Design a protein around this nucleic acid. Structure first.
Ligand SMILES: Nc1nc2c(ncn2[C@H]2C[C@H](O)[C@@H](COP(=O)(O)OP(=O)(O)OP(=O)(O)O)O2)c(=O)[nH]1
Ligand SMILES: [Ca+2]
Ligand SMILES: [Ca+2]
Ligand SMILES: [Ca+2]
Length: 341
DNA sequence: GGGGGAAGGATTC
DNA sequence: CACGGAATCCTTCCCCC
């Protein structure tokens, strides 16, 4: 099977440039301001001219200002990036019908019935890249291989604005050279666990007894690594469906006062419903980020849909259940709706 | 012994 | 000093055949 993976370069920042080309060349950082003070918040992402100095997704906006005081700092405009993404995805949907939109800027295309041998795939790659650069003026990186995982790894090795192919032979070389940490799905928590098992390469997962790999990282992940090691990973590409909609917000100050948190929670609910489109959820979860960046949630499933009146009422009850079972102060509050009809 | 929810936590991207 | 949207997986409790 031949899988082509696409991943837009420094997406949010690159969109901000396209919309104001006068930004190209200068350091661009897209921020999410929490409003706890002037520049409280984090970096959603930044362009290469900024990333080369350490400014990247996840760090505090303040840290970023210490490093690049003169960089251009723009507030994150999610709705806009979302549309630019949709237009591109619609464009990809014309090079293949079997498409899986993994994230706001990732997509896997199954082009097995559109080509043969990696030569035409590469060409189909430059075709897509050129097309996207023409109609939306966005640069993307392409990855091509036998399955979704290897297609993604390929892209990573080819960024930025690149394209690469990992053939059935190149793959065999990766199973022994690739750090188990650079495999998708293996974050820091899992990378260290596999380290204590003497698993530094994908192939090394074949040495341990399955029963103790499972004991360390769970069955799912275990069978996952083993499959990629035996070159037996072959997950189908397919339309993924939104199964959850929600909204979280940060409060000016950490609180425990129910009447103090409510207005925030109610704002989360109001946006969540507008976002719901016209979907009827039967489950609702209240999510709170406590004072020490720890997450705690409480929810309920109903035998019928949830009107907005019911969401309001139940959310307050669920928040109360949280303050009563956790002594910590609340920093962030939000709601999540699921189990749509 | 075991299926399927539901709930709350844990990780990853 | 650190935001957010959402998917998947895990352990536990449960009701009960
Ligand atoms: N709000 C928020 N957005 C994030 C975060 N991490 C990534 N994103 C955004 C950044 C991009 O706009 C989009 C895709 O992220 P990627 O990991 O693919 O990196 P990016 O697109 O920045 O460029 P790259 O792949 O490194 O060339 O998702 C995050 O921590 N918070
Ligand atoms: Ca990207
Ligand atoms: Ca991406
Ligand atoms: Ca990693």
């Amino acid at each position: 099977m031949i899988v082509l993976f696409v991943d837009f370069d420094y997406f949010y920042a690159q969109v901000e440039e396209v919309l104001n080309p006068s930004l190209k060349g200068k350091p661009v950082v897209v921020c999410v301001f929490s409003g706890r003070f002037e520049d409280s918040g984090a970096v959603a992402t930044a362009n290469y001219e900024a990333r080369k100095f350490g400014v990247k997704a996840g760090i505090p906006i303040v840290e970023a200002k210490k490093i690049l005081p003169n960089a251009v700092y723009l507030p994150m405009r999610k709705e806009v990036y979302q549309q630019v993404s949709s237009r591109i995805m619609n464009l990809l949907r014309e090079y293949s019908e079997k498409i899986e939109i993994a994230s706001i800027d990732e997509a896997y295309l199954d082009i097995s019935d559109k080509v043969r041998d990696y030569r035409e795939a590469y060409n189909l790659g430059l075709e897509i890249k050129n097309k996207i650069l023409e109609k939306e003026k966005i640069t993307v990186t392409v990855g091509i291989s036998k399955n979704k995982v290897f297609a993604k790894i390929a892209a990573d090795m080819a960024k930025p604005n690149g394209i690469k192919v990992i053939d059935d032979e190149e793959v065999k070389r990766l199973i022994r050279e690739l750090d188990i940490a650079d495999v998708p799905g293996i974050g820091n928590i899992t990378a260290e666990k596999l380290k204590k098992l003497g698993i530094n390469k994908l192939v090394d997962t074949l040495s341990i007894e399955f029963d103790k790999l499972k004991g360390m990282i769970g069955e799912a992940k275990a069978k996952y690594l083993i499959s990629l090691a035996r070159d037996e990973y072959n997950e189908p590409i397919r339309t993924r469906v939104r199964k959850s909609i929600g909204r979280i917000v940060t409060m000016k100050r950490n609180s425990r006062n129910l009447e103090e948190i409510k207005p925030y929670l109610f704002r989360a609910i109001e946006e969540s419903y507008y976002k719901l489109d016209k979907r009827i959820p039967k489950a609702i979860h209240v999510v709170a980020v406590t004072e020490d960046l720890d997450i705690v949630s409480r929810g309920r499933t109903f035998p019928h849909g949830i009107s907005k009146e019911t969401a309001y009422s139940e959310s307050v009850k669920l928040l109360q259940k949280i303050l009563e079972e956790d002594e910590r102060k609340i920093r962030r509050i939000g709601v999540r709706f699921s189990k749509f009809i």
